[PDB]
Amino acid sequence: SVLTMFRYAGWLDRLYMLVGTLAAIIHGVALPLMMLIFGDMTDSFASVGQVSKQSTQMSEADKRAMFAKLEEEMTTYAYYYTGIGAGVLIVAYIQVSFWALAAGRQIHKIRQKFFHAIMNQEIGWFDVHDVGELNTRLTDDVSKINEGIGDKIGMFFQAMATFFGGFIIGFTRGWKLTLVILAISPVLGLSAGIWAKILSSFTDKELHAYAKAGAVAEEVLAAIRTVIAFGGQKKELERYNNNLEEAKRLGIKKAITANISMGAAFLLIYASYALAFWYGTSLVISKEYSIGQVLTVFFSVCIGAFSVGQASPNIEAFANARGAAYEVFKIIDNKPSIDSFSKSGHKPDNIQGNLEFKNIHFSYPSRKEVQILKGLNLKVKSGQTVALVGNSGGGKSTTVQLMQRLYDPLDGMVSIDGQDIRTINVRYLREIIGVVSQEPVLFATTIAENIRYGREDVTMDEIEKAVKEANAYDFIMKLPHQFDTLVGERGAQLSGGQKQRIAIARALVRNPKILLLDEATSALDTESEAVVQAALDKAREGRTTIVIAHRLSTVRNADVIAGFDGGVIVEQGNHDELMREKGIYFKLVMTEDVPPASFWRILKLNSTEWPYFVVGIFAAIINGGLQPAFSVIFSKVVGVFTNGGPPETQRQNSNLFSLLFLILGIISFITFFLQGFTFGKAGEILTKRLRYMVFKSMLRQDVSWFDDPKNTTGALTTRLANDAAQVKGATGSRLAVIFQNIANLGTGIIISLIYGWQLTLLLLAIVPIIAIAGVVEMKMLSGQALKDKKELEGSGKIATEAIENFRTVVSLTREQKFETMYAQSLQIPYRNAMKKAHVFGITFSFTQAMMYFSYAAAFRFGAYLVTQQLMTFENVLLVFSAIVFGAMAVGQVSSFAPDYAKATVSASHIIRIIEKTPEIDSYSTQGLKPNMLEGNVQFSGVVFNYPTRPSIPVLQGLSLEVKKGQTLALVGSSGGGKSTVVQLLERFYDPMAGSVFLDGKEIKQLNVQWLRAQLGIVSQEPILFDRSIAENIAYGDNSRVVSYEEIVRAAKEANIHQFIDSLPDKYNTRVGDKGTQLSGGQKQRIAIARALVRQPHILLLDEATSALDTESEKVVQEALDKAREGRTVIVIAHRLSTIQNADLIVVIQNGKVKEHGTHQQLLAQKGIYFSMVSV
């Protein structure tokens, strides 16, 4: 459970990690080797020259002799530096590349395995758990695992080796002066382990909070139309901000932990080698050792602070990866009982289609304490049609869901041909069944691709036959792009009847032996339903079919009618057989350019955090300049140490040095904590602010923006989770250490200018060489990051669509198809990662090699400077010591380039989305707010074309009127434009030509929120939230807090209060995602209650009683009649029972008013209205 990641490594990855780790140990010992020949050899030679100095004795010959002696040695050391840098180029490329390649391969495998496990889970698991969290994790937690298993591990092995290599060199050059450091090393490791565990624990909770926020974002962006209709933008933003705040607090805790860890590490190493300083100096003045502090061993153990400071962030990244892997691998390791990928089961060759339910007891996992089916008995003979009738919530859809083995009954057996379906192969069982859900769901692709989900190997002739049987051929052939025309998410860019007929065809292409029809004709008009029913009855003999129809005309022709009452079959028989019993059936039939200043503009939104940046930059300057100043202070200490007079009096300086290194350690602790913490807190504030502003801007947009193919729910959620994380990757501790290293380089340059002005030219020469490689690398990485961000949204779209439509995906047995699509969508990012591995490796290797080439050049040039009597040897050594730290700082800065490109791209996109302004702005306080509404709605010659299919005319000209106390009934064929009128009255879109009036005022001159607050709308396919029944009902009026009594009154008006009260947890019963844990009629009634809680002046009913039963719709209609006068109501209905009482009926055909008048007038006249009610 600790190396749970690295689970999917294989032979090649294990070799990349060993060879990369071998290179990292070889890379790490180059710097100690640089100190070895600089310290042990040259400093000793210089001291011997000063110690064995005879003043002006044979000066003319001796000066030249010693100058040549040191110059030859320095040239040889320059050659050694060149040789070390030559191998540094290879070892550094391997260290970085090999660890990046292994990380990329492992992350690819982890993503594929995670998506496979999510698709392999069960329907009950999906009901119990939340799924927007899964969608957010698949991106964010996988990226977090990636940032901790890659080249940062190689960077840890490299600094660990520098620390140890320095220790080993010190041990070789002196005894017992490094055992003190080696004894405190375990304390440092223990501290590292403790704070790594703390940070991993914090990361787990922070990712939980981010997943909770992403779930809210996903639900809101999937129900954006309901959110906009009910003015819920402000409450949905508040819900998102609630989780953003928890994530921000956890991130601040993470920053405190990590930065106090870094500060404690620096304090501990400083105190540890300060004790060594004191003890060793006491023993050296005791003459136990001669040279232990003279620039050899104290300069070998000086790089330990740099090593620890460089190793700590990689430990933090590893801890974050461990925290991220928890939930991912928990989901991966979860195994389902009803496994749809197992090959363990029977696959009968010839199935005659006999279905039997024997004593079925079932209760849902989400509500165990509610019994749905209690001893259900049902037999379906071969090639027979059986109709399930009864009141809503009776378990009719539960029977269909059990027939597909989405759940297992708690008692009893479901069997096919006398064989238990539990022993049949699950994939085979689901493949021999075609099912149409109560409210069908499509996918964001073309019509032909949607139909191919039923059967992949289907041909175009078979598709045409299926859409002829589904009565969709004419509607598809009247479209541009015909079968290749692209539908929206869930089929949103099609009308209800068209979307349902597409699903009917998708079921038909499977050639199913068992056909499950669940309210398959709810959204179909009577004319289309007739031909669909004829087509179904033309091929009934080949298969056995179960139909759940509220339309009772289709029930009459069924072979056997089953009746549901109290979770059992009360009356089973034919039409006349049940007419004999005159029971339930009788009662029922009785009536771009990525600008370079994007990252600076995103940092101006942190202007309120300027005091945090000031102190952080000051602390970064202090601790960055401390590193080069160490050489100067050590050189000054050497002066008071080489000859202090009496050996015993040296104890004063001995205790002075311990105080110096202890105060220095305290200062390092304080400054490192400040530098990390202030920048981290500013970054945590910035991340939350950016996420908040992006979500608010997304909620501000128009419906046409969400209708775009590139703005799907998955793409939007991926954008939300990704743009903030990429910007965060270049802020905080990274941006702090960037300033730290810049101040380090500046301090080195300044002391070089003060002491030797010649080597400053070498520094100003090495800077551009690293700079050019950095800029070309950043150019390549940004160029590829644009496409990486473009392609990641597609994979997010695939994952979100599969997870949100998991029930349909499982019914169609299309898990493997979506896995293939996800894998294919991962291809371009994977290859870009593989190429970035080599690019980053080669750039890092070039930078590191240039560092050692600069060291060699500095040595060679200092040789000439000393030869020409320009610079003293001690000054040359001091400036070279500065140059080493400066070059390391420059390389560390260059290592920040990969993050900055992604940050710039994401910052540009964030700026663009934030600054975007819609046309129909709902956040605008401008517009008229009439003080008196009379409920007069007039459409005056409205011409409208949808933005996604602008070539198609929807409404050629539309003129209808309605006043207070009147009901306007919209009738017509599917796709006529009835639901477009509702969306135009809701100001979802503006008409191309024409006008819509409210009490004589143009609705474009009104306030958008004010106008929407006067409308009560229930959509054709109502959508709820994964919240309580009470929250869903109270969502109708988001301006005020709705009382419990008012919620109960609305529920009673909607004829749902009895069900809610007879249910455990009552009104606090959490509804499923989109209302899936309710019956269809129950969800429709909850939406009716949500609409009625407003007491709206205009009531918009769009097939508001499609999922209801006869008694329920009668009660709802009586309530509407009781609240009829005093409000304007527009009704879209197919049933004659909801049109008879309408004041005026308008027949809209082809987006025009064809027939108008009262029911009596339209029935007396002969035409479309008379034809539609023939039977």
Ligand SMILES: CC(C)CCC[C@@H](C)[C@H]1CC[C@H]2[C@@H]3CC=C4C[C@@H](OC(=O)CCC(=O)O)CC[C@]4(C)[C@H]3CC[C@]12C
């Ligand atoms: C040997 C010198 C020259 C270099 C020092 C190398 C160490 C910095 C690293 C590099 C490889 C590492 C090893 C890589 C993998 C493993 C296996 C690991 O055990 C398992 O993988 C199996 C147990 C489990 O499933 O968790 C225990 C740590 C260990 C020995 C690691 C210990 C630390 C090692 C030796």
Ligand SMILES: CC(C)CCC[C@@H](C)[C@H]1CC[C@H]2[C@@H]3CC=C4C[C@@H](OC(=O)CCC(=O)O)CC[C@]4(C)[C@H]3CC[C@]12C
């Ligand atoms: C300081 C040390 C690391 C230097 C030692 C010499 C290296 C340059 C050699 C020694 C072993 C070699 C590796 C041995 C085997 C392989 C497998 C070889 O073939 C594959 O399995 C690749 C398959 C694929 O790419 O799909 C790829 C290169 C690699 C890692 C080699 C790359 C070059 C390595 C690291």
Ligand SMILES: CC(C)CCC[C@@H](C)[C@H]1CC[C@H]2[C@@H]3CC=C4C[C@@H](OC(=O)CCC(=O)O)CC[C@]4(C)[C@H]3CC[C@]12C
């Ligand atoms: C001084 C001598 C010893 C040469 C030192 C460097 C080599 C060891 C380098 C140079 C070319 C490198 C190879 C160039 C390209 C590849 C392919 C690369 O695989 C991919 O690009 C991944 C593609 C995928 O996974 O689909 C794996 C490493 C490998 C073998 C590299 C291994 C390391 C190599 C041999």
Ligand SMILES: CC(C)CCC[C@@H](C)[C@H]1CC[C@H]2[C@@H]3CC=C4C[C@@H](OC(=O)CCC(=O)O)CC[C@]4(C)[C@H]3CC[C@]12C
């Ligand atoms: C480059 C050389 C000079 C040293 C660099 C690395 C070291 C600082 C060592 C000392 C402690 C080591 C660790 C000691 C214990 C573990 C836990 C170990 O976990 C397991 O595999 C547990 C199961 C098992 O014991 O097999 C994995 C390796 C790791 C992190 C080791 C990795 C290498 C570390 C960090």
Ligand SMILES: CC(C)CCC[C@@H](C)[C@H]1CC[C@H]2[C@@H]3CC=C4C[C@@H](OC(=O)CCC(=O)O)CC[C@]4(C)[C@H]3CC[C@]12C
């Ligand atoms: C010589 C100094 C300067 C550096 C040495 C650092 C290592 C000794 C530390 C750094 C990070 C540590 C790792 C951080 C993460 C973990 C998980 C942690 O596991 C737990 O105890 C919690 C697991 C659980 O939740 O059950 C301890 C082992 C391990 C591999 C740690 C092993 C020791 C490591 C490698």
Ligand SMILES: CC(C)CCC[C@@H](C)[C@H]1CC[C@H]2[C@@H]3CC=C4C[C@@H](OC(=O)CCC(=O)O)CC[C@]4(C)[C@H]3CC[C@]12C
């Ligand atoms: C402070 C941070 C930056 C350093 C931490 C380093 C170690 C904790 C890691 C780095 C690479 C890891 C190794 C990478 C790959 C594997 C294979 C992997 O194997 C399995 O767990 C197989 C399980 C299965 O096949 O089901 C785990 C052990 C091991 C040796 C890992 C042991 C722990 C290691 C040495």
Ligand SMILES: CC(C)CCC[C@@H](C)[C@H]1CC[C@H]2[C@@H]3CC=C4C[C@@H](OC(=O)CCC(=O)O)CC[C@]4(C)[C@H]3CC[C@]12C
């Ligand atoms: C920043 C680095 C990585 C790129 C630029 C490299 C220069 C800083 C180095 C590389 C070659 C060096 C030269 C190589 C050899 C010599 C000859 C050397 O004199 C001799 O060996 C004999 C006397 C003579 O003939 O001049 C004086 C220094 C000089 C000019 C060196 C000066 C510094 C140079 C230009």
Ligand SMILES: CC(C)CCC[C@@H](C)[C@H]1CC[C@H]2[C@@H]3CC=C4C[C@@H](OC(=O)CCC(=O)O)CC[C@]4(C)[C@H]3CC[C@]12C
């Ligand atoms: C081509 C790319 C990688 C950038 C160029 C950087 C290095 C290749 C340069 C910068 C520093 C140069 C070195 C600076 C100084 C010297 C000393 C000088 O050689 C001598 O010492 C000659 C006398 C003798 O043989 O002892 C000229 C070569 C050399 C190694 C230079 C070789 C080329 C180096 C490594």
Ligand SMILES: Nc1ncnc2c1ncn2[C@@H]1O[C@H](COP(=O)(O)OP(=O)(O)OP(=O)(O)O)[C@@H](O)[C@H]1O
């Ligand atoms: N996933 C679920 N988790 C918990 N309870 C559920 C779930 N799905 C349905 N229910 C409950 O199952 C019961 C049976 O309703 P079911 O979905 O079987 O509808 P039905 O009887 O076919 O009626 P309708 O005509 O409305 O479709 C209801 O009480 C409903 O709220």
Ligand SMILES: Nc1ncnc2c1ncn2[C@@H]1O[C@H](COP(=O)(O)OP(=O)(O)OP(=O)(O)O)[C@@H](O)[C@H]1O
């Ligand atoms: N968002 C959209 N983008 C593009 N075209 C759309 C969109 N929504 C609907 N359409 C199309 O506009 C036409 C009008 O459909 P509309 O939703 O108004 O039908 P309706 O009269 O309410 O009928 P139904 O009872 O089938 O829902 C149809 O051809 C439909 O496919």
Ligand SMILES: [Mg+2]
């Ligand atoms: Mg149903």
Ligand SMILES: [Mg+2]
């Ligand atoms: Mg409609």
